Structure 1
């Protein structure tokens, strides 16, 4: 799999001491833990999200996902702490936390902006691409790509996190996991075909194109925080101005499906070559027609050529 030898994995949870709680939400809790005096991140899942714990555990153990831009899996366990049975996912610890939180604390220059977005595109392309052979991997669509599910490294690269909603496709196999409704992710980031439920649930490539829509929104979030001529925008989530907090499906449908609105491009971006290029790139992620959207590899290539 992606983590420790497995026999090691079961013993890891018992060797971990939880030191600080660094995150808490409806998903559960995230802690900085220590394993042999080395930091690890321990996500303790709420009962609401227990199935996400199981699906992510299945995945990381059935596919050996190892990539610098994917959160590094260490182990998963159903363990007991303080006499309560708990669902733990243990990964590499990234002190900087989520991109969402990071963008609200500092601003970016051209180098650090491009490093962030390129690393996300590289991670997403690695998820998306199916690799044949005994040491390959199925294609993976994330289905909840957003800034809260991206972690920042000290070196300024990022890695994609939270595969609990991901769907896998082997070009050999048939059927896509999917199941239930297609509207499983974060409403604010949902593509038009999800919101209006016209997505072809049987076509795996539909899910990759949904990730690309969300990636375009993440690019917009990040680009706002890149300084140009001492100018920068405050952090805002996508569509902050046109929809309420915790927006409903109907809110999103009118903006994105009926009006076909997209996040607004700050005028000052067209005073800077990099931001001008990023604006064009994100618009090619937001086509109403999913098949017109760029692929993750095309985005990666374009970003590598920008400087």
Structure 2
């Protein structure tokens, strides 16, 4: 079990809610995602925990332990000093976080998604804000709440689900069809975030025109200095028809290559 003792953790401050914690026993800083007793995302929070137990990879935030016997409930994970990649990128000195660094981040993230692709997982919410950073530009994928292990190739969202439109693929916006491919789309947009140091996608466009524009075959222009093969991947990631999209194995491979030629 991952079940462990509440009392071992000195709490600290805000980051259901996330808090910086200290596992007394091992002099160690941790993140603890908590749930306030009564409020019934009890279903939905235990599901996150259950998912995290099954996954393990050096580019996925690691479940260290849990308190699910007795409320207040706790998920404990490894701590990532530099927090979310979107604010990291926006706030950073780009001489240090340079062209090649960007390529490593993209490469790490692809590594973890090929892993998820092998296990048949969708993240279903892939984005700069949901990536966390450590020392020496370590990056890991986080926030596994909407992650499912699919039976079959297709998770269908409930109608009147709310999506982050500007990261969501066309078949997901029309028919609520999610899949690995729909995360490929998501990943492509994240590349666009990384390449621009955290600009918001489809800048200046209302949510209510995005789908129509994707249908009439509009895609975000290549951002300043994005490599040619990075932009090529972004564009294959944005194929209307999901069969035409690449795979995470394909993408990672291409990044592995591109990354060593640097």
Paired position in structure 2 for 1:10: 4
1:261 deviates by 2.4
Paired position in structure 2 for 1:31: 19
1:260 deviates by 3.3
SS at match of 1:42: strand
**Pairing 1:144-159 to 2, within 5 Å after superposition:** 144-159=125-140
**Pairing 1:144-223 to 2, within 5 Å after superposition:** 144-169=125-150, 180-181=158-159, 183=161, 185-197=163-175, 199=177, 207-223=179-195
How many residue pairs are counted as aligned between the two chains?
252
How has the CA–CA distance of structure 1 residues 88 and 264 changed in structure 2, closer, same or farther, with 3 Å as cutoff? farther
Name structure 1 gaps, 5 residues minimum: 23-27, 131-138, 200-205, 226-234
Q: What is the TM-score with the length of structure 2 in the denominator?
A: 0.86
SS at match of 1:299: helix
How has the CA–CA distance of structure 1 residues 211 and 16 changed in structure 2, closer, same or farther, with 3 Å as cutoff? same
SS at match of 1:284: helix
The answer to whether the 8 Å contact 1:142/1:163 transfers is yes
The one of 252, 257, 265 aligned to 2:222:
265
Does residue 224 (structure 1) correspond to residue 196 (structure 2)? The answer is: yes
Q: What is the TM-score with the length of structure 1 in the denominator?
A: 0.74
**Pairing 1:122-141 to 2, within 5 Å after superposition:** 122-130=111-119, 139-141=120-122
1:251 deviates by 4.1
Paired position in structure 1 for 2:253: 301
Paired position in structure 2 for 1:20: 13
What CA distance in whole angstroms lies between the structure 2 residues aligned with 1:51 and 1:251?
35
What CA distance in whole angstroms lies between the structure 1 residues aligned with 2:69 and 2:199?
38
Does residue 92 (structure 1) correspond to residue 82 (structure 2)? The answer is: no
The answer to whether the 8 Å contact 1:45/1:86 transfers is yes
Q: CA RMSD in A?
A: 2.4
Paired position in structure 2 for 1:112: 101
How has the CA–CA distance of structure 1 residues 126 and 253 changed in structure 2, closer, same or farther, with 3 Å as cutoff? same
Higher helix share: 2
C-alpha offsets along residues 59-80 of structure 1, whole Å, 9 cap, x if unaligned?
223x2x1100111011232487
What CA distance in whole angstroms lies between the structure 2 residues aligned with 1:43 and 1:32?
9
